[PDB]
Amino acid sequence: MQNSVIIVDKNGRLVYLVENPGGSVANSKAATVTGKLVHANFGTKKDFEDLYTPVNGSIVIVRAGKITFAEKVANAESLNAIGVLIYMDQTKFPIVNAELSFTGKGKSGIPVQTISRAAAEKLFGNMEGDCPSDWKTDSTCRMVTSESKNVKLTVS
């Protein structure tokens, strides 16, 4: 299956298959990107200001809420992110029929994929850094992938 999120080594070879998500983000660009994965909470501008790790060239994972998916992606894109992962912490069930409205430049320049909660926790288990307490996130939450690992996103 193409639509997939994979944890790869520095050669791009699979180390863990995180998910082959069933749903597909409407209006997302088709691309295969690889980079460090960075948690940006809800993807609001304040959350990105809260980051200590550079967004430039990384894949961003945000949870649903507060703002539209498009606003999250636009915030990540503005900071030179290469891709976005969206999940829901409140339930195990997937985001159904994800769609992007229009903000900023009016089109999503970077690939966007929704993933299940179990997939996100799979990613957090392979990431480093405890999430800020003000985020009120689950204890599983983690901020960044370590040096040893990178995430590969393949969309549509």
- Contacts to Na ion by CB under 5 A: 51-53, 143
The residue number whose beta carbon is nearest to Na ion equals: 53
Work out the burial of residue 127: count CB atoms within 10 Å of its CB; fewer than 13 is exposed, 13-18 middle, 19 or more buried: buried
Residue 128 Cβ vs Na ion, minimum distance, rounded to whole Å: 10
Residue with smaller CB distance to Na ion, 85 or 143: 143
Residue with smaller CB distance to Na ion, 50 or 89: 50
> Could you give the CA distance from residue 48 to residue 52 in angstroms, rounded to a whole number?
9
CA 95-115-119 angle, to 5 degrees, is: 130
3-class SS shares of the chain: helix, strand, coil, % to 5: 20, 30, 50
Residue 47 Cβ vs Na ion, minimum distance, rounded to whole Å: 10
Residue with smaller CB distance to Na ion, 51 or 115: 51
> Which tokens go with 56?
């430039």
Residue 146 Cβ vs Na ion, minimum distance, rounded to whole Å: 13
Residue 40 Cβ vs Na ion, minimum distance, rounded to whole Å: 8
Residue with smaller CB distance to Na ion, 63 or 155: 63
